[PDB]
Design an enzyme around this catalytic site. Structure first.
Site, PDB file in Angstrom:
ATOM      1  N   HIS A  30      21.595  35.276  62.377  1.00  0.00           N
ATOM      2  CA  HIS A  30      20.112  35.196  62.261  1.00  0.00           C
ATOM      3  C   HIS A  30      19.690  34.187  61.180  1.00  0.00           C
ATOM      4  O   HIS A  30      18.506  33.826  61.210  1.00  0.00           O
ATOM      5  CB  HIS A  30      19.455  36.587  62.095  1.00  0.00           C
ATOM      6  N   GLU A  54      26.045  39.444  65.006  1.00  0.00           N
ATOM      7  CA  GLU A  54      25.512  38.835  63.752  1.00  0.00           C
ATOM      8  C   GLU A  54      26.610  38.012  63.049  1.00  0.00           C
ATOM      9  O   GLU A  54      26.327  37.434  61.947  1.00  0.00           O
ATOM     10  CB  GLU A  54      24.939  39.935  62.854  1.00  0.00           C
ATOM     11  N   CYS A 139      21.459  37.030  52.980  1.00  0.00           N
ATOM     12  CA  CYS A 139      22.126  37.125  54.311  1.00  0.00           C
ATOM     13  C   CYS A 139      23.067  35.915  54.494  1.00  0.00           C
ATOM     14  O   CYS A 139      22.699  34.770  54.112  1.00  0.00           O
ATOM     15  CB  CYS A 139      21.121  37.346  55.442  1.00  0.00           C
TER      16      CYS A 139
END
Ligand SMILES: c1csc(-c2ccc(-c3cc[nH]n3)s2)c1
EC number: 3.6.1.15
Lengths: 172, 172
Positions: A30, A54, A139
């Site tokens: 993402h 992911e 992230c």
């Protein structure tokens, strides 16, 4: 954590990625810009993308990072292993957050369904915030641990709960 | 918006913590024994309140006017999980969870130290990986979140070679 691990942590899209070797870069799916057609001066043509939820792995046809030695990438780690999440924050400050890893899990976190290895932060009691816990900009940061004489990377930062105590590492 | 981390400051042979613009706390044993100024202020103008391994400095001018005043308490309730906010000269920030116990006089590598006992929660070995304290960490603050408020309740005074047990020196 050793300087050669921090050198592999790379600002990328809305977060980070990690150089496993001169040709292999791993990140959280993402954070990758959706329109992007070029990476480190190379066209998509010249790159092998391996995506599993992911987790995303980029294998380049040429050495983008020849200063580095290839490291071990594993598919998560044993339950109970203590990892460090290698988080860069405002100032050249380096935040190696300690996490006790648990089972492979499927969760709903804010507006999304997330799958990977669950862990609990060992930084404090109520780590909801930037000082003791994770923030959305972290992230893609790598989960690493030391084994005998080696360091291993075993995933990338994918999500954290509202309380901040639980995190999820996306795995190959 | 100043982080907790901007309050942790290199001082003497270790560290200390800005509670407010005029109040700085540290571990007595890290303070220089030869000095005429700290932070540019002559010692004439500084109030020094010592209680065993805990020392508080109250300055006559605002040294850190960027900061708001924080709650300082004499240790915390038994069972509180505090964070020790360790800075290293690498630029690493190492917040470690510690379960706090009773006030005691403890034998720590052949030496008596009085303060609040605690046990690190980072498990098995806390050395070889960023998981425990080392001698240059003395003066790092012990903090916890209570409702909306951050609380500081003492300073890192001593740790066993083994790793597990730490002592938090406390006010009064
Ligand atoms: C009561 C009995 S042992 C104990 C804890 C062990 C580990 C804890 C913890 C919380 C955050 N990080 N580590 S709490 C409380």
């Amino acid at each position: 954590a050793p300087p050669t691990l921090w050198s592999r942590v790379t600002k990328f899209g809305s977060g980070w990625g990690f150089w496993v070797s001169p040709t292999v870069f791993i990140t959280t799916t993402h954070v990758i810009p959706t329109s992007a057609k070029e990476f480190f001066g190379e066209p998509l043509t010249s790159i092998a993308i391996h995506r599993a939820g992911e987790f995303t792995l980029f294998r380049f046809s040429k050495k983008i990072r020849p200063d580095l030695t290839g490291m071990i990438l594993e598919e998560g780690c044993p339950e109970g292993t203590v990892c460090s999440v290698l988080i860069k924050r405002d100032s050249g400050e380096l935040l190696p957050l300690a996490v006790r890893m648990g089972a492979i899990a499927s969760m709903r976190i804010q507006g999304r369904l997330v799958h990977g290895q669950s862990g609990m932060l060992l930084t404090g009691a109520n780590a909801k915030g930037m000082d003791l816990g994770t923030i959305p900009g972290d992230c893609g940061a790598p989960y690493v641990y030391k084994r005998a004489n080696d360091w291993v990377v075993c995933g990338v930062h994918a999500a954290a709960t509202k309380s901040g105590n639980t995190v999820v590492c996306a795995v190959q």
